[PDB]
Short mmCIF file of C-alpha atoms and ligand atoms in Angstrom, two decimals:
data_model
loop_
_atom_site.label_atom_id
_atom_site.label_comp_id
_atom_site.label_asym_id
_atom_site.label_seq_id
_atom_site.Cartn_x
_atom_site.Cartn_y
_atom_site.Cartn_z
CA UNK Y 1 -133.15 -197.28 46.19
CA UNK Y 2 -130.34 -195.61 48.22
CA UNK Y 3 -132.94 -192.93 49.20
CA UNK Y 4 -135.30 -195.67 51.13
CA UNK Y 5 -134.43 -196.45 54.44
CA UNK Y 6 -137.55 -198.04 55.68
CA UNK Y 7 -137.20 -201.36 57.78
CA UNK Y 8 -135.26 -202.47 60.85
CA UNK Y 9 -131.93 -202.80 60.82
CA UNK Y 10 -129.84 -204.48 63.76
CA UNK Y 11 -126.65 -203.16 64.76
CA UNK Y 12 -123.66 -204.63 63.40
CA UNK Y 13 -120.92 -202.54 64.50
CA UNK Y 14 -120.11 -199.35 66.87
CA UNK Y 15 -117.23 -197.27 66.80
CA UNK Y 16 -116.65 -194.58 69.37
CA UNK Y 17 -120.14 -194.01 71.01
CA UNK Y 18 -118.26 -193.99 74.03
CA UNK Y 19 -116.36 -190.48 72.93
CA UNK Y 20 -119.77 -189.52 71.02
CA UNK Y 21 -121.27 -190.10 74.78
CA UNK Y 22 -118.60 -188.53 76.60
CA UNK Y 23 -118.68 -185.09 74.13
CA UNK Y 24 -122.38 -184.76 75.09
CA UNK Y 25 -121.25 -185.01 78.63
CA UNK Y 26 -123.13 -188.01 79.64
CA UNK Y 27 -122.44 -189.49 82.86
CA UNK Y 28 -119.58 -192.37 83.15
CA UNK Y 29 -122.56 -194.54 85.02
CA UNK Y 30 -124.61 -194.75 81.64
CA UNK Y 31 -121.95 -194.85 79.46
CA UNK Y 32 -120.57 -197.40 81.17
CA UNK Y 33 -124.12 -199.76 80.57
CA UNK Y 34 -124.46 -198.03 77.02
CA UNK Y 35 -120.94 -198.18 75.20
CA UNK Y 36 -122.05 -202.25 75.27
CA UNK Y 37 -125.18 -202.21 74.06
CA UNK Y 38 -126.46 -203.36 70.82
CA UNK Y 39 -129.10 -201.08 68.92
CA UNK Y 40 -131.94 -201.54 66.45
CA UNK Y 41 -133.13 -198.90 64.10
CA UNK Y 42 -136.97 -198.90 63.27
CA UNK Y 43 -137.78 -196.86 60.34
CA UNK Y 44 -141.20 -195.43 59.21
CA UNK Y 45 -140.19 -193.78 56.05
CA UNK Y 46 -143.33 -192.05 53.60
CA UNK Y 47 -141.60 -189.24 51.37
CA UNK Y 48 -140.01 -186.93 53.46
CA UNK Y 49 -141.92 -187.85 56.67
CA UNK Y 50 -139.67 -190.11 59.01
CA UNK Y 51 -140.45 -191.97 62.49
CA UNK Y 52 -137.57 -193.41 63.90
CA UNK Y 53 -136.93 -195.51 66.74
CA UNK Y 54 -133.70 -196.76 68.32
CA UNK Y 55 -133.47 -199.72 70.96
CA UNK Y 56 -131.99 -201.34 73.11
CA UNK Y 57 -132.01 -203.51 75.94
CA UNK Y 58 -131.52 -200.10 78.36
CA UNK Y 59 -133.09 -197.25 76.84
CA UNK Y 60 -134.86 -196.23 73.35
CA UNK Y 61 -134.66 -192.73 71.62
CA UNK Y 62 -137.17 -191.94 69.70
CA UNK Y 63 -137.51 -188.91 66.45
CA UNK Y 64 -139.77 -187.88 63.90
CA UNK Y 65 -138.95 -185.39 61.77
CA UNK Y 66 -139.85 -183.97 58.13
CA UNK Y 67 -137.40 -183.48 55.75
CA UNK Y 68 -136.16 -179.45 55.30
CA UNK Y 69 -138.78 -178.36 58.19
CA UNK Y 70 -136.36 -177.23 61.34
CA UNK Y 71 -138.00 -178.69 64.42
CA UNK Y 72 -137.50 -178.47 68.19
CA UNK Y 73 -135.58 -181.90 69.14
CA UNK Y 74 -135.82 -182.43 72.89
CA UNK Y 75 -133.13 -185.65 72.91
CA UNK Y 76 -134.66 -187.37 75.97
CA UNK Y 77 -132.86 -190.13 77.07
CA UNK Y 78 -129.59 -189.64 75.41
CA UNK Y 79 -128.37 -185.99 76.90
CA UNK Y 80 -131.29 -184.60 77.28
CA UNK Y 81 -130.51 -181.10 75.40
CA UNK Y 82 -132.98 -178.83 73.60
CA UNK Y 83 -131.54 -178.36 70.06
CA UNK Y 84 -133.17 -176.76 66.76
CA UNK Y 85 -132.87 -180.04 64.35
CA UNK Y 86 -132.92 -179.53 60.56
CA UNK Y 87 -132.62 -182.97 58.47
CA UNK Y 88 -131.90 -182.26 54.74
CA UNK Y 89 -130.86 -184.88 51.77
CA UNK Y 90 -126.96 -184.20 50.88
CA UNK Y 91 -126.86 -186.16 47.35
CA UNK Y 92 -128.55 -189.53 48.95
CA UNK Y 93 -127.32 -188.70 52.11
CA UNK Y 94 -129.85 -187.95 54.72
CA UNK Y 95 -128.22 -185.25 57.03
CA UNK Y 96 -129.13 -183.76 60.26
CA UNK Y 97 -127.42 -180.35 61.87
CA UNK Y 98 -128.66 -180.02 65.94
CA UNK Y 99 -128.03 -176.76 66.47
CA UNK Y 100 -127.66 -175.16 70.45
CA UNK Y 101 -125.02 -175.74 73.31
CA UNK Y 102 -122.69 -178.35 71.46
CA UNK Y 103 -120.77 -177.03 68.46
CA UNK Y 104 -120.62 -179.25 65.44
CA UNK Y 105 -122.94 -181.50 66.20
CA UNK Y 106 -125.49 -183.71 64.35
CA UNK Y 107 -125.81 -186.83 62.38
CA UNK Y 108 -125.60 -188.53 58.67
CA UNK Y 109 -127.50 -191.60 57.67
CA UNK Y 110 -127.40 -193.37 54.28
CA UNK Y 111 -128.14 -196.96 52.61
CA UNK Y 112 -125.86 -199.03 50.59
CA UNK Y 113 -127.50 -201.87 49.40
CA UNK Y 114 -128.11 -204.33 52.78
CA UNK Y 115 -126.29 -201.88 54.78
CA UNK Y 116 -127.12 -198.53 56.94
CA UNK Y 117 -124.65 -195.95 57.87
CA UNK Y 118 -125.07 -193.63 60.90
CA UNK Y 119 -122.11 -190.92 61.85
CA UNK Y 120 -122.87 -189.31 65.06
CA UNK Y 121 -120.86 -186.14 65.46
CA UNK Y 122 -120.34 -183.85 68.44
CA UNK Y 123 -117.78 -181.74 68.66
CA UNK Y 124 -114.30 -183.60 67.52
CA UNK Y 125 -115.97 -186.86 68.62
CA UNK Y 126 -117.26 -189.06 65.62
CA UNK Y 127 -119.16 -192.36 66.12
CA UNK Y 128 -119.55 -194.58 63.14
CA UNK Y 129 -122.43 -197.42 63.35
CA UNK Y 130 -123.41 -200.00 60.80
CA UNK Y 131 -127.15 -201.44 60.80
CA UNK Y 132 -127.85 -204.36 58.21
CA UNK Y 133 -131.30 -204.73 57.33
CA UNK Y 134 -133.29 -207.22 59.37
CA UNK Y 135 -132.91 -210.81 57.76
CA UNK Y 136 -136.80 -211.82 56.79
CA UNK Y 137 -138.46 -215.20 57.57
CA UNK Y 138 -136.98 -218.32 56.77
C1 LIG W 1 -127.29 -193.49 76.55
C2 LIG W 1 -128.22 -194.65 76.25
C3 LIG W 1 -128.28 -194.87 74.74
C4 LIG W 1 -129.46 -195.77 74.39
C5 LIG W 1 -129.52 -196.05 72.89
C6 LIG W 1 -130.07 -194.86 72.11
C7 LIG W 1 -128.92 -194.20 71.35
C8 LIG W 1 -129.40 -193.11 70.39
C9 LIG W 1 -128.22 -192.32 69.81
C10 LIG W 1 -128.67 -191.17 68.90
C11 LIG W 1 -129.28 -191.80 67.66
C12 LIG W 1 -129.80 -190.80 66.66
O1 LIG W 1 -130.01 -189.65 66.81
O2 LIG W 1 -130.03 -191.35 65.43
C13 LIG W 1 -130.86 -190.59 64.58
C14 LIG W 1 -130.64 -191.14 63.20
O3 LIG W 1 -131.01 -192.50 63.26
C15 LIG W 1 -132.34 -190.79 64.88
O4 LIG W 1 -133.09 -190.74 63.67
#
């Protein structure tokens, strides 16, 4: 099931957004507000057709994408940067190059068991994030 990443899944822990923030040049204000802030992943997974949404209590940034079809990501709200996006499976390993003004930078997002990994790379900055799937009713 390591290919199924469907649900929500709450932040658990956030390494180095604030150099993954600072490589894409965003401004100290709003990094200042965002290196604190907690994020939720929402998932629509059917195939290789994926809506994501991640929250917070500032901003949300929002992507759908299809795996292997290169698309035009316009990443409002983050850096706000055209890049050409291309999301392929490495092994189970979903993995995203953003291609444009930023060398080396893009994303890789995986499940293990409970558990959801997200590197966010720009440049020599990496960000590691853990999600853990949304605990169901009582
Ligand atoms: C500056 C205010 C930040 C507000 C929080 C929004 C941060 C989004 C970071 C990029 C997440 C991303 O591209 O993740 C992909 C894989 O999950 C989307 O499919």
């Amino acid at each position: 099931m390591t290919r199924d990443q469907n649900g929500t899944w709450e932040m658990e822990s956030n390494e180095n957004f604030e150099g993954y923030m600072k490589a894409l040049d965003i401004d100290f204000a709003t990094r200042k507000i965002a290196v604190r802030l907690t994020q939720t992943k929402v998932i629509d997974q059917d195939g290789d057709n994926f809506k994501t949404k991640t929250t917070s209590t500032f901003r949300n940034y929002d992507v759908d994408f299809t795996v292997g079809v290169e698309f035009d990501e316009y990443t409002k709200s983050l850096d706000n940067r055209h890049v050409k996006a291309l999301v392929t499976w490495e092994g189970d390993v979903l993995v995203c190059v953003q291609k444009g003004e930023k060398e080396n930078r893009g994303w890789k997002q995986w499940i293990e068991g409970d558990k959801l990994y997200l590197e966010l790379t720009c440049g020599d900055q990496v960000c590691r994030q853990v999600f853990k799937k949304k605990l169901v009713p009582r």
